[PDB]
Amino acid sequence: PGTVFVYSGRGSQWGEELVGIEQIQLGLIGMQLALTELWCSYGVQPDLVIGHSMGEVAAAVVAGALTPAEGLRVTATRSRLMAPLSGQGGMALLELDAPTTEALIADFPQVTLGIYNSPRQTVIAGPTEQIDELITRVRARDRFASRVNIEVAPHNPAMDALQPAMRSELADLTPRTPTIGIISTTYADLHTQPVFDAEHWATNMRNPVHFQQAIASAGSGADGAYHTFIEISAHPLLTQAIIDTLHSAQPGARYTSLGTLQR
Ligand code: NA
Ligand code: NA
């Protein structure tokens, strides 16, 4: 049937308190790497990995493209660069398809489509006050929208200024060809076979997250079909997005979507 491990970007976290983007993101990838090995111990191993947003670092590590130390180095480097933007940007989950979302935000230069969740769910990202105005406009149209609280909002033009620093501080990264299959969510073209280098991580933090497209490709018979998707997290937040994407793209197909832990 095929098993996919899905690594979320900003999953739930909560036994000492993790404080600030750097500490929180480090506890997240630490928990992802340790939960992945726990699954392996009970015979369950991934044939393919998909990383969502900041989760693509952990997915690149599990796939063998980067070492655990290299993954932690990307995590710490990126988190330190993003920290001065703490609280400035926000995200919103909209119950709109991607073309309707693009139309809604076309006149907001600082707000972009951040994540393709599923066909009828799209996340936007940008300055928190602009995200609030857009939530109000979506609600005023008798449509649904909700805030997605995050330490620093990636996948929007505020990340452009951090890309030179990323390309510079991660210059000596030595990624390898992955040992396990990985579908990147960084590029609209899923056949852009990516080298998981400095340029890839600088691009990944700014580009939209092509999550629906990566899940649909994994579920498709093209390049082999996978039927079990396991979110490797402390609480399942992407499971309904996985099912909504797969049911829409292959309506007569059977898929199983599950988490690792639950709060
Ligand atoms: Na815009
Ligand atoms: Na496939």
Side-chain angles (χ1 to χ4, degrees), residues 1-12 15 17-41 43 46-79 81-119 121-175 177-192 194 196-246 248-253 255-261:
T3 302
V4 188
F5 279 20
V6 181
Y7 296 87
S8 71
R10 206 291 191 188
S12 312
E17 196 179 355
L18 269 60
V19 171
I21 184 167
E22 303 161 85
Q23 276 214 308
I24 282 150
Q25 294 300 324
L26 288 169
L28 284 170
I29 189 176
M31 187 86 180
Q32 285 167 330
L33 297 184
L35 287 171
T36 300
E37 277 166 64
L38 178 58
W39 272 110
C40 188
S41 300
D47 302 294
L48 189 96
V49 301
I50 296 174
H52 170 278
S53 178
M54 312 285 98
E56 183 150 300
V57 170
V61 172
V62 171
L66 257 49
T67 68
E70 274 169 353
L72 298 179
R73 193 209 166 182
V74 172
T75 304
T77 289
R78 184 179 54 189
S79 285
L81 288 172
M82 281 168 80
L85 299 187
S86 293
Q88 293 177 26
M91 296 177 108
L93 176 59
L94 311 182
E95 307 303 326
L96 301 175
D97 65 23
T100 302
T101 296
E102 295 279 25
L104 167 70
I105 66 179
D107 47 359
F108 276 69
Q110 290 180 277
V111 178
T112 56
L113 189 156
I115 310 175
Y116 296 89
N117 258 24
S118 69
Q121 282 212 319
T122 306
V123 177
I124 57 172
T128 199
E129 65 278 8
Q130 301 181 20
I131 292 303
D132 282 348
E133 178 175 358
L134 287 161
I135 287 172
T136 297
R137 290 187 174 198
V138 172
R139 286 175 185 168
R141 289 163 46 171
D142 300 307
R143 302 293 183 263
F144 306 96
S146 64
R147 270 195 70 90
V148 172
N149 298 320
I150 191 154
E151 290 62 25
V152 174
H155 320 300
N156 73 88
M159 303 290 109
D160 292 342
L162 312 179
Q163 296 180 305
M166 287 279 295
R167 298 167 185 133
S168 302
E169 298 184 18
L170 298 159
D172 65 337
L173 266 190
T174 64
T177 288
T179 70
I180 296 166
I182 177 160
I183 307 178
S184 179
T185 57
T186 296
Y187 311 96
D189 180 10
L190 304 166
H191 301 97
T192 303
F196 292 95
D197 57 9
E199 189 57 80
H200 183 79
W201 303 113
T203 294
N204 164 270
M205 75 188 312
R206 168 59 183 92
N207 276 11
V209 176
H210 301 84
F211 186 66
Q212 173 186 330
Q213 298 86 347
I215 292 298
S217 177
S220 171
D223 307 328
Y226 304 82
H227 294 263
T228 301
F229 290 78
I230 309 178
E231 179 178 328
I232 314 302
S233 66
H235 186 84
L237 294 168
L238 302 173
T239 62
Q240 194 69 54
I242 288 169
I243 305 162
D244 290 344
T245 289
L246 294 164
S248 171
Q250 320 257 331
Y255 295 100
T256 292
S257 182
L258 54 110
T260 295
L261 290 186

